[PDB]
Amino acid sequence: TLQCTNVTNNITDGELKNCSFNMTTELRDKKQKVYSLFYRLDVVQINSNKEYRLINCNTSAITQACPKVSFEPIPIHYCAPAGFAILKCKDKKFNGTGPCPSVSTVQCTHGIKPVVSTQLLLNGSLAEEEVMIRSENITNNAKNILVQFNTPVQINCTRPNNNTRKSIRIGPGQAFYATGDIIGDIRQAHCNVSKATWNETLGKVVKQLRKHFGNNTIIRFANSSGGDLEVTTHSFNCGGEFFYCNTSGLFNSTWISNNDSITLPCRIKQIINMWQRIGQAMYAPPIQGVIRCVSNITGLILTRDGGSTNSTT
């Protein structure tokens, strides 16, 4: 049970809770009155000031990621043993399905960074000539549509908060990294995108879509219809913290047949159940100082709509 108070700001409202609580020490009998800070997505209140508890505690056990291991992606080349080999389809405009004109063999794929991200794809492979649009089936709106860019889209993501990290002794050998104070101004995480190149890429795509729908037609963009936070917003790990950014401003557009930058409000979570596997959750420790990272946006995952009006848009 967590005694949480809202965070010290001059009104204009918390997301972040200054939660005192009793802990244990390396001594089995002596206990430890401590406090930490948590984002609201990690805690849930439990019904004087309001007491709280971690959102996982009631479903899934929780472990604190080792602070030494890094979540940073690394290019991985998958390889084939003797008697087997890998085939690299090389033709430029290639919809991933059907035969391939130019076929070459390698024993190993290229460097592949396992980027774990939802909605937006980052740091990935670009397409050749036109931007290729691949979906196992488009008639099936339910089949997700995967997009490959010819040009990367820059994005600048920060956690603009200089972060203290307290290490708490629950041992022997067991140590919990809490959050001390933010140092100075409290700002919320965000990402920026050149509104220009962004809207430029929306059009380069929409001209690639009418190739599959009408010579003259209308195309509209909307934010996610619903789901978990991982789907409704853009999940990604920036600098060790796990970000979730409101993309409603990216998908709020309409297209007919014929200088500044956007900014995306982001949310950070620490208790993580990624891959949704109940029973087991990971608590990511906090990252010290202000976080910043920058990525080439290189692809997309999108869903269509339904019968509705026939051919209007």
Partner: protein
């Protein structure tokens, strides 16, 4: 040439409405924000409240909502009233203007900034005294100079409360004016003195009228000073 001038009542009984007005000069009332400030004897400075262009007043919560502020666009007269006064409220009151600074650190779309106020132009600072003791007007006598640059003046005796202003020839004699601190008698009655310097050849030819004003008692005295009959 924006100027500020107060108008104090000079004395109010405890638990009575304390009215003060600060006359606005040199511009209009709608370009900036307005504020009032006080200082109690022996204590520090104290911020009271402010009011903006759209006239919504905003007070310091430490006042228990006993304060009200009003402007007057036509009069260009900024008003001020204080009900339920206490003797501890005796102080010296100013008026000033508020520039709304906006300190921006992070992103504006998220409002990562704040509003601050700096005080540029100022009032003169009239004096008021919350007291339940009956008012006391000043007693005026013309101090006669010496017959041997000499000295002459006027006496202000047993007035309650402060302030009392002394002017020579209705504001015509400036150089030489030295007014001195008003003593606190054991009777709780003030006694001050004002003095101005002149050459030795102007006695009898020049007429010196000290002009005394005790506004609490509405006491305005145009007293004349003459040399001794010897």
């Amino acid at each position: 040439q924006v100027q500020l001038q107060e108008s104090g009542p000079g004395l109010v009984k405890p638990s009575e409405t304390l009215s003060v007005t600060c006359s606005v000069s040199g511009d209009s009332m709608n370009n900036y924000y307005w504020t009032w400030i006080r200082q109690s004897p022996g204590k520090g400075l104290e911020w009271i409240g402010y009011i903006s262009d759209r006239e919504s007043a905003t007070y310091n919560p430490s006042l228990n909502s006993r304060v009200v502020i009003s402007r007057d666009t036509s009069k260009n007269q900024l008003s001020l009233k204080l009900n339920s006064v206490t003797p501890a409220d005796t102080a010296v009151y100013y008026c000033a203007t508020a520039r709304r600074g906006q300190r921006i650190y992070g992103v504006v779309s998220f409002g990562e900034f704040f509003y601050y106020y700096s005080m540029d132009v100022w009032g003169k600072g009239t004096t008021v005294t919350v007291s339940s003791a009956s008012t006391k007007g000043p007693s005026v006598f013309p101090l006669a100079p010496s017959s041997k640059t000499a000295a002459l003046g006027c006496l202000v005796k047993d007035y309650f409360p402060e302030p009392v202003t002394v002017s020579w020839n209705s504001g015509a004699l400036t150089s030489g004016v030295h007014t001195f601190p008003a003593v606190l008698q054991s009777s709780g009655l003030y006694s001050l003195s004002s003095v101005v310097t002149v050459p030795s050849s102007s006695l009898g030819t020049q007429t010196y009228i000290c002009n005394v004003n005790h506004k609490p008692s509405n006491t305005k005295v145009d007293k004349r000073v003459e040399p001794k009959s010897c």
